[PDB]
Paper text:
Because of the flexibility exhibited by this complex, we performed 3D reconstruction of the individual Huc lobe from two datasets, obtaining resolutions of 1.52 Å and 1.67 Å. Density maps and the fourth coordinating residue of the 3 iron–sulfur clusters of HucS indicate they all have a [3Fe–4S] configuration. The redox properties of the Huc proximal and medial clusters may be further modified by an unusual d-isomer of histidine, indicated by the cryo-EM maps, at position 166 of HucL. In Huc, His166 also interacts with the proximal cluster, but the d-isomeric configuration shifts the position of the backbone carbonyl of His166 so that it interacts with a highly coordinated ligand in proximity to the medial cluster. We were unable to identify this ligand, although its elongated density suggests that it is not water, and it may have a role in tuning the redox potential of the medial [3Fe–4S] cluster. Although the narrow hydrophobic gas channels greatly kinetically favour H2 diffusion over O2, Fourier transform infrared (FTIR) spectroscopy analysis and the cryo-EM structure indicate that the active site of Huc isolated in ambient air is in an oxidized state with a bridging hydroxide ligand. The head group of menaquinone is stabilized by hydrogen bonding between its oxygen groups and the terminal hydroxyl of Tyr301 and the backbone carbonyl of Lys212, as well as π–π interactions with Tyr229 of HucS. Concordantly, analysis of the hydrophobic gas channels of Huc that provide H2 access to the active site indicates that they are markedly narrower than those of structurally characterized O2-sensitive and O2-tolerant [NiFe] hydrogenases.
Here we determined the cryo-electron microscopy structure of the Mycobacterium smegmatis hydrogenase Huc and investigated its mechanism. Huc is a highly efficient oxygen-insensitive enzyme that couples oxidation of atmospheric H2 to the hydrogenation of the respiratory electron carrier menaquinone. Huc uses narrow hydrophobic gas channels to selectively bind atmospheric H2 at the expense of O2, and 3 [3Fe–4S] clusters modulate the properties of the enzyme so that atmospheric H2 oxidation is energetically feasible. The Huc catalytic subunits form an octameric 833 kDa complex around a membrane-associated stalk, which transports and reduces menaquinone 94 Å from the membrane.
Author numbering:
A (entry chain A), D (entry chain C): 4 to 516
B (entry chain B), C (entry chain D): 2 to 323
Write the structure that this text describes.
């Protein structure tokens, strides 16, 4: 059965999913990013810092992540100096945006599908409806309402959220005061207590982070009533009851560009020194092996994308040349999403799933430095039960407690008497690579500055990695493969497709920019 | 009142900003203020044909559509077909045509919907335009004479993104019987928010008054006004951003970021041409090319000169201290 | 850290303002920030001897007292005995002597505790004085040389009342290891809040810049600055009141009420003498007797004259419109 | 047994209570207001509008009420014109302050005593501890935290709370915009939904206001789980279980000066026209009969107060001449509270209990006009079970839903294009009487302006009415009589004294000013 789902909403933009269903299971899937704005085209010839304004407008939910990497692209391009405080503020605000995204997406974009009638027979369905029903869910309302708190911290340092450009080459525009930091801590603590611990976990962030294995997570759910009936515990039990752990596995190969630089190790941002300075480690997990991320291995294919091109392009020389969808579809093109691929040795240019799960696998890589995230939890989950909608979601929600602690510590680390900005030299020439881990995964900017102008500006967003269409080798993108194998109980309401696409927290505005 | 929220050439920033709403929060606004949010791309439960059924009913008049909120640009490319923005089986512009004409009120939220915004910057690959404006030029996609069924033009809630209050308070006013209290300026913006300037309530106006310039970012923003060296457009930008603080915390200018004039139709001003980002365009290095709204260069510079001489000592020192 | 909050010649406004705290709220501050609120007249569970046991332990050093918050004046009348304020079997001043000397930090919250405030206005029937100040004169009740066990003077959190953030953020800083980031001005006020002026962030500074005066209350406050006809002390008052909005909504001056200079030690200024309430004292009806801090009459008036001539049209019209 | 409780806290100021306990029951009680500031003395010779600044500083929690009546004292003294919008704003802000006071006082000042060990044997004690425990009570935290919301509305119109003086002769200083009113409605609706309906009532305000009899209240508690387990329903059940309905009866005679003028009926404030224009009706309920309030019948006695004087003084000619407590106690004086008494025909100058209960009885008076509060609920409760700590409390909490609806309607009634202020003539001469119903009851200002100066300024606060000491006839004040008959299970922790004094929401800073 050929099924075309249009629109598949709650993916931050326009998504149309075409699947071939055989015996109730998706055998093939096509992800169609249907909206294009061409910010990369617009950025050409613009001020070198125009990305700080434009790139956040790629996306409302993850625009601060765009700002973070857009600034670091300039920091590397202009060989700037990053005062430790500025790095902390960037880290805090990047994490805070993600901390806002995690509940906002989970309740508003993802969890409401748990009330789908396909689960009506579940003993937990009524509770899921009470909790996650749109706009009235007892967990929906506070989770969504409180999701604004972390970005209040962002606004404290950035002036506002969304739509700040306060991360500039050389640091940040802002000069946080004592009340800014204390208020930010108070907001973060209140949000962590009120939502993350009381609602999501039913326990302390520390208790959740003691989970180093899948069995620990299962035991954590059954340890006591609070964790059992927490949104996390209920979600895990609901997933295991309704089968969200059975599909959405996807490629099983992951890309994490990492973010959250250790301030002392990225005072002079460079492309080469990026990986070592990361706290949230970069890492490519493919074929069961850990690889060090190298932006040089990133290529974007547009064979099935509505762009001109015949071979994969590294984003430094990347092009965004639209083709009319009418003509593109005659050539087999079906998405405005490029097809980012990573050159993994022995595997060639392969799709890599980006997102929290990718980060969690990267954090499980060996040889972690002291400042680096070293978490074996999702290596064990990956080996124990493998990827799925549930595991992918749990990776996302696992970062809440993890990032909260990082932000809480970074706020303490701020030395308010010290510099937040080093006046950079606005070099007329420079190639910059800024990358971060937006809430949805690896977000990367490749910028080429020439004649004090943006010569080239290529943005590869995490959902482009995940939702990008088939490459020249017809290899499905991570979401497309994750969709493959997804059961379809009701073709009229193919919620399982939404689960898989939303389990990636897919952002279509990011996908295409 | 039924609300249908569509995203065209959008980044969803206005939705996310909208979701940050407080007093009322989005959930209370959707549920507790009689505002039936029929669908929203970022929040709507329906997908596929189920979502299309809602859209068509509003488009064809099967069910009432009281408020049509459009976020993002009306994408007309390629060649006016709008296929660079395909939504629910149609070009988004086609949905806009039907839903805007079927809606009692049409609200353009964000510069993209109001005026074209960032996607409308040259070369405008998506053929982006606002609902009723293309930058400052009235007419946009729907035409200058478009009026909703209640006789109102597109209510432009500008911003990149719009502050949640700029839309929610309007929605509350509509829901609480205060639609008549809503007055719109020449850009169809609610005057209750856009008669003030971004500078209105800015923490640096005293520095602006005494022409004390922020010289550098970071700790340099502990003093001074961003007008002179960072191209702050606050004095030329209509907004409550420093009256109604962003995220209930701050604003760009308070935090040390120049106002980009994102409530004004020309945003991004100068299309972010080289030298215009976080810089004040000046003539001879001393006279800003753009002076505050309602001022002329001669009197502004003369007053500025007098202000510097009269500038008190505190205006030259850090004030936003740790 | 143990917190003992006492009220002398207090109205509890700082407590009520404190209870309006958000980010953090009072409950989270008391519970979630390690701040053990041993007792508070408005919140303490203990009464009678049970409450006295807590007070005496702090006073006699039986139990640690980290922060002694005093609200209200130190009432010394009649004849320096303090019996116009009897608390827990002693004159409140006696409690202040013991607890301030036993406390690691002493925080005077509100003008009454900081400087004497309203109860200290003439004829001062209660013999009211601040902990370490009597109006602007240093020394108050504890003397100029008083230092808490951590070597700090009385931390003056002024205001009538103090904004919750002026105290809670300080308490958070103490609780989060940022006591060293707290810098105090000559009045022992946290500079992080009191280096700015009330005018800093006021929505009327543009009118002030162009010397456009609010002429009448109510709808007359939709335009203009309150300096010239309503005696607004914002330019002479150190406060974040328009940076950190009151109740997260507004401030006096934004709402159309002149700043009374209640963060300054002289509050109420001129002891609310006839003609000084909501009026600007002027010489010859044109020159304000008090000019903004750091300014002189000659340059201010000269700049003011230039500003009027350069005043843009919008500065003379309503801006805070419906 | 002679017991001296010092301090009796959570009464907004310094209170010392002396009681004579015989067989576990208080037979005599003395209320000692122990802190004096002399604002009435300070106001002498000051600017006629100095009360707008000074009187709010009488009290933090009820300062806006002071402002409300202080402004109306000037409005009457100067024969000002009050635009309807200004009256609405004053009404809204007066009610909003009271709406803030009701939960703040109930949870922070009163309910925590419900966790007293004297109730350890109650089957509801554990639940009371969970709900009302100080700073951790599941009802304490949200009730106190949300109590700030109504005064955000106050701040919207007044700039801040506490400590606004925005109510001036001729109207209000402020010029509310559309966003001010919509935000105020949103804040009020959120507060009503989140605390008043979900937490306090477990039902709509309309449902609670359908209670016209005590039996209706009892049936309302048992009608369903939400109302049964609401703070209100639990409080009623807790009171009936632990015996808070058995004592604290007090005088049984009540004074309500009323407030919340109908805008069309008080455009030109006068002393004579005050009662008719009131929405929250004035009224003196004494000896089972309803009397119309007349400020001329108010007298303040200082026989047992630390003031000079030999006969009761009407506050227009009132004096605040302190006597040293050492000398005063030798003369039998024991409080800084004056002894306000009301001349009820046939009863002479009698103490009258002020507060919500007084208002509720006044609202039950006959001949209510359409704009006037007409509520027979507490006439029935008074006849059925009589006054008590519980009934007094219920009257307070009954006004939450009632005042919320009034404020919600007043916000709608605002005509934002119309005047908020009429420039008054600052007459050098004038006698003004401003009165309102602060959260604690009848709050009244008698001001005499002469030579453009405050010649006399007398403030009679509701707790002065309630907590004022014995008059020249040795007749106990309402709280003193309410204390009489109160059981004392534990002399070391005489919580029952706190219940009675706090059931009046006693404010000692107001008492003395
Ligand atoms: C001419 C001029 C000079 C300044 O130094 C300055 C500083 C801050 C804001 C504005 C100005 C300005 O307009
Ligand atoms: C001299 C003078 C004249 C004004 O009109 C004025 C208006 C508003 C604020 C201040 C002033 C001022 O100082
Ligand atoms: N998170 C996020 Fe957005 C996507 N995809 C970016 O970058
Ligand atoms: N409410 C209140 Fe305060 C008292 N008593 C006043 O007036
Ligand atoms: S927030 Fe986004 S939708 Fe348009 S107006 Fe700004 S780019
Ligand atoms: S006063 Fe503020 S709004 Fe801009 S021009 Fe100066 S930083
Ligand atoms: S950029 Fe826009 S959000 Fe406000 S501060 Fe300037 S009008
Ligand atoms: S609020 Fe009250 S306690 Fe003193 S400082 Fe002002 S009179
Ligand atoms: S700018 Fe504002 S602070 Fe007062 S002096 Fe004018 S109203
Ligand atoms: S009176 Fe005080 S509260 Fe602020 S606005 Fe003026 S310093
Ligand atoms: Mg790209
Ligand atoms: Mg009095
Ligand atoms: O995203
Ligand atoms: O009070």
């Amino acid at each position: 059965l050929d099924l075309f789902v249009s629109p598949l909403g709650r993916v931050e933009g326009d998504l149309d999913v075409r699947v071939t269903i055989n015996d109730g299971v998706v055998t093939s899937a096509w992800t169609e990013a249907a909206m294009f704005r061409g910010f990369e085209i617009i950025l050409r010839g613009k001020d070198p810092q125009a990305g700080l304004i434009v790139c956040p407008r790629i996306c409302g939910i993850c625009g601060g992540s765009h700002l973070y990497k857009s600034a670091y692209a300039l920091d590397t391009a202009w060989r700037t100096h990053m005062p430790p405080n500025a790095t902390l503020i960037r880290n805090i605000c990047q994490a805070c945006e993600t901390l806002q995204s995690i509940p906002r997406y989970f309740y508003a974009l993802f969890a409401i599908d748990l009330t789908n009638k396909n689960y009506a027979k579940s003993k937990l369905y009524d509770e899921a409806v009470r909790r996650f029903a749109p706009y009235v869910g007892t967990s929906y309302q506070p989770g969504v309402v409180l999701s604004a708190k972390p970005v209040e911290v962002y606004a404290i340092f950035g002036g506002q959220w969304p739509x700040s450009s306060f991360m500039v080459p050389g640091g940040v525009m802002s000069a946080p005061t004592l009340s800014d930091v204390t208020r930010a801590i108070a907001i973060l603590e209140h949000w962590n207590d009120n939502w993350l611990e009381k609602q999501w976990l039913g326990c302390s962030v520390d208790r959740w982070l003691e989970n180093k294995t899948w069995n620990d997570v299962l035991a954590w759910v059954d340890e006591n009533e609070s964790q059992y009936n927490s949104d996390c515990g209920f979600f895990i039990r609901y997933c295991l009851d309704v089968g969200l752990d059975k599909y959405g596995q996807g490629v099983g190969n992951y890309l994490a560009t990492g973010t959250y630089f250790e301030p002392s190790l990225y005072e002079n941002p460079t492309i080469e020194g990026r990986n070592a300075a990361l706290i949230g480690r970069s890492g490519v997990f493919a074929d069961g092996r850990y690889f060090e991320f190298d932006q040089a291995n990133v290529t974007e294919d547009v064979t099935h994308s509505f762009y001109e091109g015949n071979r994969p392009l590294h984003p430094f020389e990347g092009e965004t040349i639209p083709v009319n969808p009418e003509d593109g579809r005659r050539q087999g093109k079906y998405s405005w999403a490029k097809s980012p691929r990573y050159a993994v040795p022995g595997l060639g240019n392969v799709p890599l799933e980006t997102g929290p799960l990718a980060r969690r696998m990267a954090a499980s890589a060996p040889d972690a430095e002291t400042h680096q995230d070293d978490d074996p939890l999702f290596a064990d989950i990956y080996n124990a039960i493998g990827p799925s909608v549930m595991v992918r979601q749990l990776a996302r929600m696992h970062e809440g407690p993890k990032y909260y602690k990082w932000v809480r510590q970074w706020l303490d680390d701020l030395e308010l008497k010290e510099s937040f900005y080093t006046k950079p030299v606005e070099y007329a020439e420079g190639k910059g690579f800024g990358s971060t881990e937006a809430a949805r995964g690896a977000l990367s900017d490749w910028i080429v500055i020439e004649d004090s102008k943006i010569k080239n500006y290529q943005v590869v967003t995490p959902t482009a990695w995940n939702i990008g269409p088939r490459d020249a080798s017809e290899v499905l993108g991570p979401i497309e493969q994750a969709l493959v194998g997804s059961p379809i109980v009701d073709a009229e309401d193919p919620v399982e497709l939404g689960h898989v696409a939303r389990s990636f927290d897919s952002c279509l505005v990011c996908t295409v920019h | 009142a039924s609300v249908l929220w569509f995203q065209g050439g959008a980044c969803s920033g206005n939705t996310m900003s909208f979701l940050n709403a407080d007093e009322p929060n989005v959930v209370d606004l959707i549920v507790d203020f009689g505002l039936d949010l029929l669908w929203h791309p970022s929040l709507g439960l329906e997908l596929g044909n189920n979502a299309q059924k809602v859209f068509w009913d509003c488009a064809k008049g099967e069910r009432p559509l009281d408020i049509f909120v459009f976020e993002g640009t009306v994408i007309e490319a390629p060649n006016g077909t709008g296929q660079m923005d395909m939504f629910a089986g149609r070009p988004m512009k086609d949905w806009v045509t039907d839903l805007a004409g079927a809606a009692q009120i049409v609200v353009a939220i964000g510069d993209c919907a109001c005026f074209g915004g960032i996607p409308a910057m040259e070369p405008n690959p998506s053929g982006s335009t606002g609902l009723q404006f293309h930058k400052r030029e009235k007419g946009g996609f729907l035409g200058p004479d478009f009026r909703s069924k209640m006789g109102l033009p597109v209510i432009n809630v500008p911003g990149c993104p719009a502050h949640p209050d700029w839309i929610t308070q309007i929605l509350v006013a509509l829901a609480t019987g205060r639609a008549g209290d809503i007055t719109l300026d020449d850009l169809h913006r609610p005057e209750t928010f856009f008669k003030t300037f971004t500078q209105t309530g800015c923490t640096r106006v005293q520095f602006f008054e005494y022409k004390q310039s922020t010289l550098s970012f970071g700790e340099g923003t502990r003093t001074g006004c961003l007008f002179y060296e960072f191209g702050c457009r606050g004095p030329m930008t209509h907004s409550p951003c420093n009256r109604i603080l962003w995220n209930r915390q701050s604003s760009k200018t308070r935090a040390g970021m120049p106002c980009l004039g994102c409530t004004e139709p020309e945003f991004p001003h100068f299309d972010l041409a080289p030298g215009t980002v976080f810089k004040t365009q000046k003539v001879s290095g001393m006279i800003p090319k753009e002076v505050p709204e309602g001022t002329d260069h001669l009197t502004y510079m003369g007053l500025a000169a007098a202000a510097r001489i009269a500038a008190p000592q505190w205006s030259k020192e850090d004030m936003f201290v740790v």
